Design a protein around this ligand. Structure first.
Ligand SMILES: CCCCCCCCCC(=O)N[C@H]1CCSC1=O
Ligand SMILES: CCCCCCCCCC(=O)N[C@H]1CCSC1=O
Ligand SMILES: [Co+2]
Ligand SMILES: [Co+2]
Ligand SMILES: [Fe+2]
Ligand SMILES: [Fe+2]
Lengths: 314, 314
């Protein structure tokens, strides 16, 4: 049935349960890990991913969706190991994560060649395995929609038309990259309701966030805990106002938490400064209680974390 | 022993023999191969590499230096297997190959943090292995000297001043990037004679080439066979002109041959169109016979292929 799971038989979308739509078990740069393996510890990385997932399950999370793709160090065999040790429903994805240019391989290669790579992961399997991709992940940031960023977007559209898997995105909340990701995809024939425009929760500008929701796509209020982008209390208030204005239809919430990440911006000793409370269960400790005592019905919590993910994969 | 070798004990610079200063056994994008291994055949890659090196050895090549680094899919273990199968002297290196930006790993990481990686490869070994790097490889192309490109160059300088190993560069002949690479490296305290400014053979402009030579660095006439950058005959007239003008003390010659390469611009089928005669032995078949016909004797060939690489690694 039409949702593939890492190390498990597939399930129907109605069986997804409580879902976290955007969480990384591990992130690394493929090129630097390949060249300098001494910078990494797989024992620590497995210990962290298992600990976080187990705690996620304790709070009632049934399914985690992980958009670690090319550029972010996707590893399906690490993901199987985490599944076997926890029992979680894990949805793996395909795609390319870039800000400016594609890797040299892609020099003079068509959009169709790029789409064939995604369709491979969806139909055949990931990294010589039999685990399939459940979605396509794309990215854009400060540099905007560059020539290569766009090729990858249109390639994601071809994958969706051909397989009916949904599309998750990375955008900079301060550009209109999300508005442009949505525009290109829908022009290519992708159903707006099959798109999650990510990182809209990094901004207060509710006029911009509603513009994407008004066009039919889900909105990623998905970086809860990352105070360097936007503090938790401004996020909570943006979330509350959107619900009050009648947008729980399109709202999806997550942490974008990485149990381990190799970026120089990450580490401990920056966590107290930049993201003090950032973990995989923060919405349970803060966001959900906050909303409950500010007039938000239990029905709304069900829409955001159950009905919206189910629809997204339907 | 000064110079370290793959799969072999190190040698003195004087026993280097006839050398090809810039050739690739295999090049691939690291992120692409890790995520989509169905695109690659290793048996075919090994076979292509062994056969090329065998022809070079028959023609008298004792040593090959391979500037494949991060971004080009360096693989010390694949390099080991080729050494075993032929018996060639192979000099591996360290460094970073980028045109625009560094991998996400390097976000807010110091130039010294980059230098430490190069130094680890030179002093400790490559990829969990006891084989050591004998030079540092850096790059710049059309986008010019970006802030990440400049960072890698300045890091190469630290590795050279700390380990004494020479620096090989990739440049765009039409940009001034080679002259800028030399300027930045010398301003940092690098001996001009420990620098090879690459891909200067891609241009007619003898004034630009001589400029770099006058400042004390080796000049890279190193892409023989790649007619799309500059055809063999126009390369021959520039090489001959430079030798006649007295510049053989600074000339280095190679082909930049890739036994396999995953770049889409380099599909083996564009070969007859873009680089028909390109192989690891073109200079034995065309260039050297051309120079000999034109009056340059055997001792001048010995300077370029034996004495200059010796100086470089001394
Ligand atoms: C102490 C933690 C530092 C704050 C994290 C800053 C890094 C930016 C957020 C971030 O981690 N973005 C990456 C990670 C997952 S995929 C992706 O897009
Ligand atoms: C086979 C058809 C001819 C096109 C050659 C492909 C592009 C030029 C050769 C080439 O791509 N060299 C690259 C690879 C190593 S370093 C570098 O900058
Ligand atoms: Co993101
Ligand atoms: Co090059
Ligand atoms: Fe993410
Ligand atoms: Fe090269």
């Amino acid at each position: 049935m039409r949702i593939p799971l890492v190390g498990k038989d597939s399930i129907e979308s109605k069986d997804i349960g409580f879902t976290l739509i955007h969480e990384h078990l591990r992130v690394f740069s493929e090129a630097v890990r390949q060249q300098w393996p001494h910078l990494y510890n797989e024992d620590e990385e497995f210990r962290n991913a298992v600990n976080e997932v187990k705690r996620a399950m304790q709070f009632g999370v049934k399914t985690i969706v992980d958009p670690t793709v090319m550029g972010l160090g996707r590893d399906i065999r690490f993901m199987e190991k985490v599944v076997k040790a926890t029992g979680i429903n894990l949805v793996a994805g395909t795609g390319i994560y870039i800000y400016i240019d594609l890797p040299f391989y892609f020099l003079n290669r068509s959009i169709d060649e790029i789409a064939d790579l995604f369709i491979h992961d969806i139909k055949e399997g990931i990294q010589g395995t039999l685990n399939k991709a459940g979605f396509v992940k794309i990215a854009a940031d400060e540099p905007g929609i560059t020539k290569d960023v766009e090729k990858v977007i249109r390639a994601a559209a071809i994958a969706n038309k051909e397989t009916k898997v949904p599309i998750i995105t990375h955008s900079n909340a301060h550009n209109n990259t999300g508005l442009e990701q949505q525009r290109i995809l829908t022009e290519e024939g992708v159903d707006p309701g099959k798109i999650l425009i990510g990182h809209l929760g990094d901004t207060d500008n509710i006029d911009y966030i509603k513009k994407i929701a008004d066009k039919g796509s889900f909105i990623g209020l998905d970086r809860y805990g990352l105070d360097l982008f936007l503090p938790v209390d401004k996020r909570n208030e943006t979330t509350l106002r959107l619900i009050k204005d009648g947008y729980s239809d399109k709202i999806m919430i997550s942490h974008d938490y990485c149990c381990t990440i190799d970026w120089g911006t990450a580490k401990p000793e920056y966590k107290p400064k930049l993201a003090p409370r950032w973990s995989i269960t923060l919405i349970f400790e803060d966001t959900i209680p906050f909303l409950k005592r500010n007039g938000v019905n239990e029905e709304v919590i069900a829409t955001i974390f159950k009905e919206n993910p189910k629809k997204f994969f339907s």
